[PDB]
Design a protein around this ligand. Structure first.
Ligand SMILES: NC[C@@H]1O[C@H](O[C@H]2[C@@H](O)[C@H](O[C@@H]3[C@@H](O)[C@H](N)C[C@H](N)[C@H]3O[C@H]3O[C@H](CO)[C@@H](O)[C@H](O)[C@H]3N)O[C@@H]2CO)[C@H](N)[C@@H](O)[C@@H]1O
Ligand SMILES: NC[C@@H]1O[C@H](O[C@H]2[C@@H](O)[C@H](O[C@@H]3[C@@H](O)[C@H](N)C[C@H](N)[C@H]3O[C@H]3O[C@H](CO)[C@@H](O)[C@H](O)[C@H]3N)O[C@@H]2CO)[C@H](N)[C@@H](O)[C@@H]1O
Ligand SMILES: NC[C@@H]1O[C@H](O[C@H]2[C@@H](O)[C@H](O[C@@H]3[C@@H](O)[C@H](N)C[C@H](N)[C@H]3O[C@H]3O[C@H](CO)[C@@H](O)[C@H](O)[C@H]3N)O[C@@H]2CO)[C@H](N)[C@@H](O)[C@@H]1O
Ligand SMILES: [Mg+2]
Ligand SMILES: [Mg+2]
Ligand SMILES: [Mg+2]
Ligand SMILES: [Mg+2]
Ligand SMILES: [Mg+2]
Ligand SMILES: [Mg+2]
Ligand SMILES: [Mg+2]
Ligand SMILES: [Mg+2]
Ligand SMILES: [Mg+2]
Ligand SMILES: [Mg+2]
Ligand SMILES: [Mg+2]
Ligand SMILES: [Mg+2]
Ligand SMILES: [Mg+2]
Ligand SMILES: [Mg+2]
Ligand SMILES: [Mg+2]
Ligand SMILES: [Mg+2]
Ligand SMILES: [Mg+2]
Ligand SMILES: [Mg+2]
Ligand SMILES: [Mg+2]
Ligand SMILES: [Mg+2]
Ligand SMILES: [Mg+2]
Ligand SMILES: [Mg+2]
Ligand SMILES: [Mg+2]
Ligand SMILES: [Mg+2]
Ligand SMILES: [Mg+2]
Ligand SMILES: [Mg+2]
Ligand SMILES: [Mg+2]
Ligand SMILES: [Mg+2]
Ligand SMILES: [Mg+2]
Ligand SMILES: [Mg+2]
Ligand SMILES: [Mg+2]
Ligand SMILES: [Mg+2]
Ligand SMILES: [Mg+2]
Ligand SMILES: [Mg+2]
Ligand SMILES: [Mg+2]
Ligand SMILES: [Mg+2]
Ligand SMILES: [Mg+2]
Ligand SMILES: [Mg+2]
Ligand SMILES: [Mg+2]
Ligand SMILES: [Mg+2]
Ligand SMILES: [Mg+2]
Ligand SMILES: [Mg+2]
Ligand SMILES: [Mg+2]
Ligand SMILES: [Mg+2]
Ligand SMILES: [Mg+2]
Ligand SMILES: [Mg+2]
Ligand SMILES: [Mg+2]
Ligand SMILES: [Mg+2]
Ligand SMILES: [Mg+2]
Ligand SMILES: [Mg+2]
Ligand SMILES: [Mg+2]
Ligand SMILES: [Mg+2]
Ligand SMILES: [Mg+2]
Ligand SMILES: [Mg+2]
Ligand SMILES: [Mg+2]
Ligand SMILES: [Mg+2]
Ligand SMILES: [Mg+2]
Ligand SMILES: [Mg+2]
Ligand SMILES: [Mg+2]
Ligand SMILES: [Mg+2]
Ligand SMILES: [Mg+2]
Ligand SMILES: [Mg+2]
Ligand SMILES: [Mg+2]
Ligand SMILES: [Mg+2]
Ligand SMILES: [Mg+2]
Ligand SMILES: [Mg+2]
Ligand SMILES: [Mg+2]
Ligand SMILES: [Mg+2]
Ligand SMILES: [Mg+2]
Ligand SMILES: [Mg+2]
Ligand SMILES: [Mg+2]
Ligand SMILES: [Mg+2]
Ligand SMILES: [Mg+2]
Ligand SMILES: [Mg+2]
Ligand SMILES: [Mg+2]
Ligand SMILES: [Mg+2]
Ligand SMILES: [Mg+2]
Ligand SMILES: [Mg+2]
Ligand SMILES: [Mg+2]
Ligand SMILES: [Mg+2]
Ligand SMILES: [Mg+2]
Ligand SMILES: [Mg+2]
Ligand SMILES: [Mg+2]
Ligand SMILES: [Mg+2]
Ligand SMILES: [Mg+2]
Ligand SMILES: [Mg+2]
Ligand SMILES: [Mg+2]
Ligand SMILES: [Mg+2]
Ligand SMILES: [Mg+2]
Ligand SMILES: [Mg+2]
Ligand SMILES: [Mg+2]
Ligand SMILES: [Mg+2]
Ligand SMILES: [Mg+2]
Ligand SMILES: [Mg+2]
Ligand SMILES: [Mg+2]
Ligand SMILES: [Mg+2]
Ligand SMILES: [Mg+2]
Ligand SMILES: [Mg+2]
Ligand SMILES: [Mg+2]
Ligand SMILES: [Mg+2]
Ligand SMILES: [Mg+2]
Ligand SMILES: [Mg+2]
Ligand SMILES: [Mg+2]
Ligand SMILES: [Mg+2]
Ligand SMILES: [Mg+2]
Ligand SMILES: [Mg+2]
Ligand SMILES: [Mg+2]
Ligand SMILES: [Mg+2]
Ligand SMILES: [Mg+2]
Ligand SMILES: [Mg+2]
Ligand SMILES: [Mg+2]
Ligand SMILES: [Mg+2]
Ligand SMILES: [Mg+2]
Ligand SMILES: [Mg+2]
Ligand SMILES: [Mg+2]
Ligand SMILES: [Mg+2]
Ligand SMILES: [Mg+2]
Ligand SMILES: [Mg+2]
Ligand SMILES: [Mg+2]
Ligand SMILES: [Mg+2]
Ligand SMILES: [Mg+2]
Ligand SMILES: [Mg+2]
Ligand SMILES: [Mg+2]
Ligand SMILES: [Mg+2]
Ligand SMILES: [Mg+2]
Ligand SMILES: [Mg+2]
Ligand SMILES: [Mg+2]
Ligand SMILES: [Mg+2]
Ligand SMILES: [Mg+2]
Ligand SMILES: [Mg+2]
Ligand SMILES: [Mg+2]
Ligand SMILES: [Mg+2]
Ligand SMILES: [Mg+2]
Ligand SMILES: [Mg+2]
Ligand SMILES: [Mg+2]
Ligand SMILES: [Mg+2]
Ligand SMILES: [Mg+2]
Ligand SMILES: [Mg+2]
Ligand SMILES: [Mg+2]
Ligand SMILES: [Mg+2]
Ligand SMILES: [Mg+2]
Ligand SMILES: [Mg+2]
Ligand SMILES: [Mg+2]
Ligand SMILES: [Mg+2]
Ligand SMILES: [Mg+2]
Ligand SMILES: [Mg+2]
Ligand SMILES: [Mg+2]
Ligand SMILES: [Mg+2]
Ligand SMILES: [Mg+2]
Ligand SMILES: [Mg+2]
Ligand SMILES: [Mg+2]
Ligand SMILES: [Mg+2]
Ligand SMILES: [Mg+2]
Ligand SMILES: [Mg+2]
Ligand SMILES: [Mg+2]
Ligand SMILES: [Mg+2]
Ligand SMILES: [Mg+2]
Ligand SMILES: [Mg+2]
Ligand SMILES: [Mg+2]
Ligand SMILES: [Mg+2]
Ligand SMILES: [Mg+2]
Ligand SMILES: [Mg+2]
Ligand SMILES: [Mg+2]
Ligand SMILES: [Mg+2]
Ligand SMILES: [Mg+2]
Ligand SMILES: [Mg+2]
Ligand SMILES: [Mg+2]
Ligand SMILES: [Mg+2]
Ligand SMILES: [Mg+2]
Ligand SMILES: [Mg+2]
Ligand SMILES: [Mg+2]
Ligand SMILES: [Mg+2]
Ligand SMILES: [Mg+2]
Ligand SMILES: [Mg+2]
Ligand SMILES: [Mg+2]
Ligand SMILES: [Mg+2]
Ligand SMILES: [Mg+2]
Ligand SMILES: [Mg+2]
Ligand SMILES: [Mg+2]
Ligand SMILES: [Mg+2]
Ligand SMILES: [Mg+2]
Ligand SMILES: [Mg+2]
Ligand SMILES: [Mg+2]
Ligand SMILES: [Mg+2]
Ligand SMILES: [Mg+2]
Ligand SMILES: [Mg+2]
Ligand SMILES: [Mg+2]
Ligand SMILES: [Mg+2]
Ligand SMILES: [Mg+2]
Ligand SMILES: [Mg+2]
Ligand SMILES: [Mg+2]
Ligand SMILES: [Mg+2]
Ligand SMILES: [Mg+2]
Ligand SMILES: [Mg+2]
Ligand SMILES: [Mg+2]
Ligand SMILES: [Mg+2]
Ligand SMILES: [Mg+2]
Ligand SMILES: [Zn+2]
Ligand SMILES: [Zn+2]
Lengths: 112, 249, 86, 50
RNA sequence: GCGAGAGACCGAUAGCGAACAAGUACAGUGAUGGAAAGAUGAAAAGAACUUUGAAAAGAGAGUGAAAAAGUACGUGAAAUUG
RNA sequence: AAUAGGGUGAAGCCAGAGGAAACUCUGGUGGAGGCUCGUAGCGGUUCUGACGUGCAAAUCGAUCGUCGAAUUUGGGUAUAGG
RNA sequence: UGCUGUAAAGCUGGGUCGAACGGCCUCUAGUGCAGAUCUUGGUGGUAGUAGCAAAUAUUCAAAUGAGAACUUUGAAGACUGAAGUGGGGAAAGGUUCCAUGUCAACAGCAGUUGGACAUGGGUUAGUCGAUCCUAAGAGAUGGGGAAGCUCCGUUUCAACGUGCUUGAUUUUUCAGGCCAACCAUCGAAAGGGAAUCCGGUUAAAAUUCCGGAACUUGGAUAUGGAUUCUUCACGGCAACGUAACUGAAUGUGGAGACGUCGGCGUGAGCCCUGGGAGGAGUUAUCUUUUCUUCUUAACAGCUUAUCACCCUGGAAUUGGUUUAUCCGGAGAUGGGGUCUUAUGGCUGGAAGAGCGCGGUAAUUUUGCCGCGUCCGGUGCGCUUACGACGGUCCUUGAAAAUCCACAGGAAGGAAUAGUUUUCAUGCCAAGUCGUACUCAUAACCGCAGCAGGUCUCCAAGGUUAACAGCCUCUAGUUGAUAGAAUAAUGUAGAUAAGGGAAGUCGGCAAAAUAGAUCCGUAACUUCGGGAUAAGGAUUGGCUCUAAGGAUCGGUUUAACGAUCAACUUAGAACUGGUACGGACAAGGGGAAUCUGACUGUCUAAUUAAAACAUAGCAUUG
RNA sequence: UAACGAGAUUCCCACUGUCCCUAUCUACUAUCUAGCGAAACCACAGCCAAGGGAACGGGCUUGGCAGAAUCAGCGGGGAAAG
RNA sequence: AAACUUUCAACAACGGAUCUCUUGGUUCUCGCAUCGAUGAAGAACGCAGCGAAAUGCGAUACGUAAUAUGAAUUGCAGAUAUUCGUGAAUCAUCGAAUCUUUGAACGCACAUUGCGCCCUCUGGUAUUCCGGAGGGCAUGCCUGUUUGAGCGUCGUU
């Protein structure tokens, strides 16, 4: 079987010197240098991979349209679906309870 | 003779602490207006391992009272603190596990950790895993408090000095044998270069005061004066007593 | 083991060329010339090494400016040009 | 090495140019005393100083 | 350092390390260390040409006052050698 | 950044059997360990072999220790003569 | 050649030579050599002696040449045997590269040959690296020490922006609005990091040149599309979709970005292989045979996925489910959906290329022409990438530059028109330095072409547990002075009757054992070991037998049919000069004493141990 | 003190040229040739016995004797070299 | 008797003593006072028709100008070089210039021919992006200018 060589001056098997082996139209077997695998965009609240957002190496996000980098919702490309739902319910109930703790202290400013 | 292992440490070339992997300095908040007069509320975001420390650290997020920005503090995690817990810090904070209170606001018998030696130094006493400080009593006329330290010493601190309610997490670590030398190697791999230790009696007289002889032996008393000089203080320095400790102290 | 086998592991230059004296005495890790003292303002020279002073002193290079002070001094440091005689 | 600095490559250029034999018309000058270039250098024999 | 005049000085293993492309060649990672090495002849007239040889060279020849001066160059001791 | 192929078979898990219970037993599964045989590697036990004006200012041959970690190692960097 | 003098010495005949020198009275001194393991230079005997013996190995012929064991070419015989004697690189060298000529010196013989000598030629980048970021660290500044060379300090007792952003203004003024926790710098050709591929081309360069096809960043900028009268889009219950589809200050997140193992799955490349279309080899005999071509880049579109998530729904007769035990009223099974596009497919790139054949043009630069280049299978395979999982730590396994999204709502926007360069298309530019070659039994370092040392990538067939050993394909070598003999003594390797450690300080050395299957396995023990304890049996070849599966197909007899497929285990008969792990590979074992618990570490170059370390114990501050 | 050990020691089984007691075989040397070609060492050198002598002579004294030039081995001596 | 060994002589070798020189050295005396931010000493790289070194020089590169002098230079070559003359050669002399990358070394940096910013002009549809040319941006300190800071502080509403 044909054997291959690195295509650059780096002779060491580092993370940035990964190669794949590809067969060319010349029937030869040559090394093609591959780039580092992208990591998934993750939720800032729960840490899970966000759905609907492309997985790219960071500079590549600048050269792609916005529909690939976001989701049509509040906090779209930043928080998860369940975490946005949980933020909304917590915001509503606590602020509703904020009225209760206020009115409960104005009724006791007349009877107590 | 030669410079002994005691003295080469002062230059601190290979004897500096290994701090690449450290997660931050464990400190209380800077004493500010909110802590001096009322209370401020923060939330525990992470409980993480700090290399070189037996105690886990907690990263707690507070809001900034003066500008729109979030401030992340690195506290020593007390046992029972959980992620998402609300931590209340200040003079008027309540006696709940994890809250940071001035010493005068805590009754006698309160178990507290990361106690300030001086008001606003952000923590000096009771910071290792399983350790804590017991509050012995108060002297309100002089604004002073008596506490018991992990060493068993009683200390008098300003009652305005702050501390964190509870015991430092991770206690009982010493209960397990290390077994292997490799376990100690990895323990000190992220602390400093202090392991392993060669016995001075096994070296030559140039290398150490205990070295030399046709048998391994110290030759003179290993209790060394407090007034001895550098290069002599190897052994039991200013030892009040020696031998097996029998009875109570 | 400490001789011929160990002498095979010499491929890391401790010194490289100096910009001041061009000698390859510039300690790479120390960033100093052991010969010329670069980047110190003064030149490295010792009175216990007089032969080193011989090797690098006034007159061992071109003296591209001190060459001509004697000839300009001898004429009293003239200003103007020589005038052709009638 | 293949990866070399400009400062290195310029010194190697001078070393090649200094590694010429004596031009032969120089021996014909009057009162000429140089018979050969006495500052010849082989790469394997004597190493430079870089 | 600059410009000069001198000597009961040394005479190329001497005299400065260096009379010469000498702080040169070369050694050492580096600080540093550091030589050897002057002389054909008045003048190249540095041997055209022929010949043997693959050639270097040799033999004739030629130049020269001298080749018992041929850039292994004045003179040419000893060790050592035919 | 690097480290063939085997042996052993720790926790955990599945099924079955015995027992009043407390529990015990059996067959699998699993893949632990500064465990083990053993390459590369790292080391250097014995022949007190070779050589000992050497291939070599420490090598060569066979034999041998260890070989998944207190592992091996490149490069950068720090520590400098009492 | 002689003479004189006791002598130190003086004179003289002959030869050589070529430019200065002597006698006498005195002065002066760096003034007399056989030694000093003297200094520098030169030269002997030794002596044509020791020796030029590791790395399996060479031979015939022709060509060239004066000359050929050694150069070139051809033929053969071999080796390295993918952990290479192969193909590249980092460090180091610096022209050793290539062509021509060439042998005085060097290549410890030789030399027509060379990494030698001489003359020339040769290294082409927006995309490969530098440059940029920060790492351990290094290190200026305000300062504080020190007589001083300098030391400390890196945001530090500091008034620390050569700040920006707009509307502009053409009044080259401004008007101002925001901020300035942290922010000198250097520091990686293996960390982080914008972007290139295929075919072809040279004597020597190529991800650099030629051809074609792409991509990024910075800049300019118009058209189409998109959007608005409900101004800053629509759709979907939802996960979310999109060709687009305002968003200041400030804030929050993500990527950058990260340990090591274990088994499983998938891909890619390699390995194996079936039809068909070609070429070569063997062919006394046999072989529908053996070997070989049948390939497809970056990039664009569509499609393609475990995990995860959404809708529906409400579970004991608990169910689902992995090789590995977890999940479910905090919503399982079931049904239906969403996403990441890693990876595969199709298509474009692209057959026009490349490849294999056949026919031709011709001293001929270089070709011209025709045919084919298709469809599959297989797997506890190897290497590697990825995924979902499980284990592990008194160990929990970088930073910064840089990019994006979100929160927020400043400000600005339409109706006869407005906005936006995150949709498509179009325009311009990408500088500087390195780039040849060696990477080692000859290009580095060991004084040298030294059996030493020196970091890393790719890796075929057979046997096999195996990347071991042995043999072989590709590639590369056939290099190591040679010829003739074959005493002693060696060095390296073999064998030996009977005895079997009597040898010796001592079994030193050698020998014996050895793979795999079944059986069997003692004291002691910290119950984990000891253990391969000990000790037995078997093993070839051939012909069979038996067991072990996959995919489809329907009233639960599918308990059956169809098709396809891999090597494992066990057993039987026969067979041979009783051999069979047949080469290779490959434990000797047992009973005790001393000692250190163990793994580990050290005297590089005479000591590896009982020495050091260790966990554990105890004491001190 | 189980386990571990290239640690020191004793015994047993197996195995053996360690030995009785040696013999035989192979390659490479040594050997001869062509080419090439060092080094250590060297007061002068090199036959013995006795004597005396710095009490262990190559030299001196007294005797034995003694015939050119040489090759492979060898390890008594040169109180050999280092 | 040869060979061999040793001695002697002649010639030839080896080697470089001896003799003789000497643009060098050494020492004494006499006389002079002149490095650099107007960028020194020193370093690297280059420069000639044909040069490697030494010497000299700096992209004006073995030199440009001027002055003096007055026909060379020379190893070869060669003038669109020169001769009763603004004219050959010459570190003879020297008063004008040139003087690469550096170096006390000065925009920051430097194991990099790495990275900025300002002014004028210029090219590419350009105040902003890309290219080119020329001129600038170091530190301590002094005198002065301008712009500022402090209830340190004076006067006044
Ligand atoms: N880094 C700041 C602090 O400096 C201090 O360190 C000490 C030093 O500054 C100085 O100590 C000297 C020291 O300079 C010197 N090189 C060694 C000497 N043993 C010390 O001495 C010290 O210890 C001795 C003990 O006998 C006491 O008697 C004495 O009071 C104390 N000064 O005095 C300080 C103590 O008074 C803190 N002790 C130290 O923990 C910390 O590092
Ligand atoms: N494993 C599932 C997927 O992979 C992720 O993790 C990937 C790796 O990060 C992970 O690697 C190992 C894993 O072997 C095993 N679970 C142990 C270890 N915790 C993991 O490692 C990880 O966690 C450690 C925490 O100590 C980090 O320090 C480390 O950087 C990270 N790689 O295993 C995965 C290999 O593909 C996440 N576990 C999960 O969220 C994701 O869905
Ligand atoms: N017997 C040895 C072994 O067992 C097998 O051999 C089997 C038989 O052939 C043998 O026995 C048979 C006997 O039954 C009948 N007479 C037939 C056969 N000739 C005999 O066997 C004899 O035959 C030849 C002689 O050299 C051998 O191969 C064989 O070992 C021997 N025993 O014994 C075995 C069982 O009965 C295999 N051939 C092989 O594994 C090996 O030979
Ligand atoms: Mg390459
Ligand atoms: Mg990288
Ligand atoms: Mg790519
Ligand atoms: Mg991730
Ligand atoms: Mg977080
Ligand atoms: Mg989307
Ligand atoms: Mg883009
Ligand atoms: Mg976008
Ligand atoms: Mg998308
Ligand atoms: Mg000392
Ligand atoms: Mg403190
Ligand atoms: Mg240590
Ligand atoms: Mg100790
Ligand atoms: Mg201890
Ligand atoms: Mg100890
Ligand atoms: Mg000792
Ligand atoms: Mg002492
Ligand atoms: Mg004492
Ligand atoms: Mg002692
Ligand atoms: Mg002891
Ligand atoms: Mg003791
Ligand atoms: Mg090294
Ligand atoms: Mg170094
Ligand atoms: Mg300086
Ligand atoms: Mg200068
Ligand atoms: Mg390299
Ligand atoms: Mg190169
Ligand atoms: Mg050459
Ligand atoms: Mg070399
Ligand atoms: Mg040097
Ligand atoms: Mg170099
Ligand atoms: Mg003078
Ligand atoms: Mg003078
Ligand atoms: Mg005078
Ligand atoms: Mg001399
Ligand atoms: Mg003399
Ligand atoms: Mg001298
Ligand atoms: Mg020296
Ligand atoms: Mg003469
Ligand atoms: Mg003469
Ligand atoms: Mg004459
Ligand atoms: Mg002649
Ligand atoms: Mg004549
Ligand atoms: Mg004469
Ligand atoms: Mg003569
Ligand atoms: Mg002569
Ligand atoms: Mg003589
Ligand atoms: Mg690998
Ligand atoms: Mg293994
Ligand atoms: Mg059960
Ligand atoms: Mg082990
Ligand atoms: Mg082992
Ligand atoms: Mg064992
Ligand atoms: Mg391996
Ligand atoms: Mg080895
Ligand atoms: Mg050895
Ligand atoms: Mg030996
Ligand atoms: Mg010997
Ligand atoms: Mg053997
Ligand atoms: Mg071994
Ligand atoms: Mg063994
Ligand atoms: Mg491990
Ligand atoms: Mg390391
Ligand atoms: Mg000293
Ligand atoms: Mg002393
Ligand atoms: Mg005469
Ligand atoms: Mg004369
Ligand atoms: Mg004298
Ligand atoms: Mg003498
Ligand atoms: Mg000598
Ligand atoms: Mg000799
Ligand atoms: Mg011989
Ligand atoms: Mg030999
Ligand atoms: Mg040969
Ligand atoms: Mg073979
Ligand atoms: Mg192999
Ligand atoms: Mg190789
Ligand atoms: Mg090659
Ligand atoms: Mg050349
Ligand atoms: Mg050639
Ligand atoms: Mg030769
Ligand atoms: Mg020829
Ligand atoms: Mg070649
Ligand atoms: Mg570029
Ligand atoms: Mg790049
Ligand atoms: Mg750049
Ligand atoms: Mg750039
Ligand atoms: Mg960047
Ligand atoms: Mg730092
Ligand atoms: Mg610096
Ligand atoms: Mg400093
Ligand atoms: Mg200062
Ligand atoms: Mg100061
Ligand atoms: Mg201050
Ligand atoms: Mg202005
Ligand atoms: Mg940098
Ligand atoms: Mg990098
Ligand atoms: Mg890199
Ligand atoms: Mg083409
Ligand atoms: Mg083509
Ligand atoms: Mg073409
Ligand atoms: Mg090439
Ligand atoms: Mg294109
Ligand atoms: Mg739309
Ligand atoms: Mg913003
Ligand atoms: Mg944030
Ligand atoms: Mg991150
Ligand atoms: Mg990693
Ligand atoms: Mg990283
Ligand atoms: Mg895995
Ligand atoms: Mg696979
Ligand atoms: Mg596959
Ligand atoms: Mg056949
Ligand atoms: Mg649905
Ligand atoms: Mg049911
Ligand atoms: Mg499994
Ligand atoms: Mg849940
Ligand atoms: Mg893809
Ligand atoms: Mg057709
Ligand atoms: Mg077909
Ligand atoms: Mg690999
Ligand atoms: Mg993985
Ligand atoms: Mg928004
Ligand atoms: Mg907000
Ligand atoms: Mg909003
Ligand atoms: Mg750029
Ligand atoms: Mg560069
Ligand atoms: Mg290349
Ligand atoms: Mg290589
Ligand atoms: Mg190799
Ligand atoms: Mg060789
Ligand atoms: Mg070698
Ligand atoms: Mg080679
Ligand atoms: Mg050397
Ligand atoms: Mg080697
Ligand atoms: Mg190696
Ligand atoms: Mg195999
Ligand atoms: Mg293997
Ligand atoms: Mg393999
Ligand atoms: Mg041969
Ligand atoms: Mg051989
Ligand atoms: Mg022979
Ligand atoms: Mg023999
Ligand atoms: Mg033998
Ligand atoms: Mg044999
Ligand atoms: Mg045999
Ligand atoms: Mg036999
Ligand atoms: Mg026998
Ligand atoms: Mg018999
Ligand atoms: Mg027998
Ligand atoms: Mg027996
Ligand atoms: Mg015995
Ligand atoms: Mg005995
Ligand atoms: Mg043995
Ligand atoms: Mg043996
Ligand atoms: Mg036997
Ligand atoms: Mg056997
Ligand atoms: Mg057994
Ligand atoms: Mg064997
Ligand atoms: Mg035994
Ligand atoms: Mg031990
Ligand atoms: Mg004990
Ligand atoms: Mg070590
Ligand atoms: Mg040793
Ligand atoms: Mg030693
Ligand atoms: Mg050992
Ligand atoms: Mg040893
Ligand atoms: Mg104990
Ligand atoms: Mg204590
Ligand atoms: Mg041992
Ligand atoms: Mg043992
Ligand atoms: Mg004993
Ligand atoms: Mg024998
Ligand atoms: Mg012999
Ligand atoms: Mg011979
Ligand atoms: Mg020879
Ligand atoms: Mg001798
Ligand atoms: Mg006799
Ligand atoms: Mg006597
Ligand atoms: Mg006598
Ligand atoms: Mg005698
Ligand atoms: Mg004698
Ligand atoms: Mg006598
Ligand atoms: Mg006699
Ligand atoms: Mg003897
Ligand atoms: Mg001798
Ligand atoms: Mg001579
Ligand atoms: Mg003389
Ligand atoms: Mg003089
Ligand atoms: Mg100029
Ligand atoms: Mg200059
Ligand atoms: Mg420079
Ligand atoms: Mg500049
Ligand atoms: Mg440049
Ligand atoms: Mg520069
Ligand atoms: Mg830069
Ligand atoms: Mg100034
Ligand atoms: Zn979330
Ligand atoms: Zn320098």
């Amino acid at each position: 079987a044909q054997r291959v060589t690195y295509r650059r001056r780096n002779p060491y098997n580092t993370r940035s010197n990964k190669i794949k082996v590809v067969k060319t139209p010349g029937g030869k077997l040559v090394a093609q240098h591959v780039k580092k695998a992208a990591s998934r965009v993750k939720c800032g609240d729960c840490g899970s991979a966000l759905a609907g957002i492309s997985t790219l190496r960071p500079r590549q996000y600048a050269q792609v349209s916005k529909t690939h980098k976001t989701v049509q919702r509040a906090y779209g490309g930043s928080r998860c679906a369940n975490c946005v739902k949980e933020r909304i319910v917590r915001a509503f109930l606590i602020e509703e309870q904020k009225i209760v703790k206020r009115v409960l202290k104005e009724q006791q400013d007349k009877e107590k | 003779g030669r410079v002994i292992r005691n003295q080469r440490k002062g230059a601190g070339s290979i004897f500096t602490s290994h701090t690449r992997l450290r997660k931050g300095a464990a400190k209380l908040r800077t004493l500010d207006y909110a802590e001096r007069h009322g209370y401020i509320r923060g939330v525990v975001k992470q409980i993480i391992h700090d290399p070189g420390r037996g105690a886990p650290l907690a990263k707690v997020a507070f809001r900034d009272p003066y500008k729109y920005k979030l401030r992340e503090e690195t506290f020593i995690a007390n046992e029972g603190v959980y992620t998402g817990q609300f931590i209340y810090a200040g003079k008027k904070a309540s006696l709940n596990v994890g809250n940071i209170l001035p010493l005068g606001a805590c009754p006698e018998g309160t178990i507290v950790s990361n106690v300030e030696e001086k008001v606003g130094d952000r923590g000096a006493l009771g910071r290792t895993s399983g350790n804590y400080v017991i509050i012995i009593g108060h002297n309100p006329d002089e604004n002073k408090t008596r506490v018991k330290l992990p060493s068993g010493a009683k200390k008098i601190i300003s009652s305005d000095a702050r501390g964190v309610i509870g015991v430092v997490a991770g206690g009982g670590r010493i209960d397990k044998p290390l077994l292997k030398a490799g376990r100690a190697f990895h323990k000190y791999k992220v602390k400093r270069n202090s392991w392993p230790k060669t016995r001075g009696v096994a070296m030559n007289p140039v290398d150490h005061p205990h070295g030399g002889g046709n048998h391994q032996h110290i030759g003179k008393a290993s209790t060394i004066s407090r007034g001895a000089v550098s290069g002599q203080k190897a052994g039991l320095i200013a030892a009040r007593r020696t031998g097996l400790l029998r009875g109570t102290q | 083991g400490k001789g011929t086998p160990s002498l095979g592991k010499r491929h890391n230059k401790s010194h490289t060329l100096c910009n001041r004296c061009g000698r390859r005495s510039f300690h790479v890790q120390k960033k100093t010339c052991s010969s010329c003292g670069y980047p110190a303002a003064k030149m490295r020279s010792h009175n216990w090494a007089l032969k080193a002073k011989r090797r690098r002193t006034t007159g061992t290079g071109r003296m591209a400016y001190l060459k001509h002070v004697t000839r300009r001094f001898k004429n009293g440091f003239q200003t103007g040009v020589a005038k052709a005689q009638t | 090495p293949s990866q070399k600095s400009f400062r290195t490559k310029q010194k190697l250029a001078k070393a090649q140019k200094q590694n010429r034999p004596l031009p032969q018309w120089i021996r014909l000058r009057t009162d000429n005393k140089i018979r050969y270039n006495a500052k010849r250098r082989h790469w394997r024999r004597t190493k430079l100083g870089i």
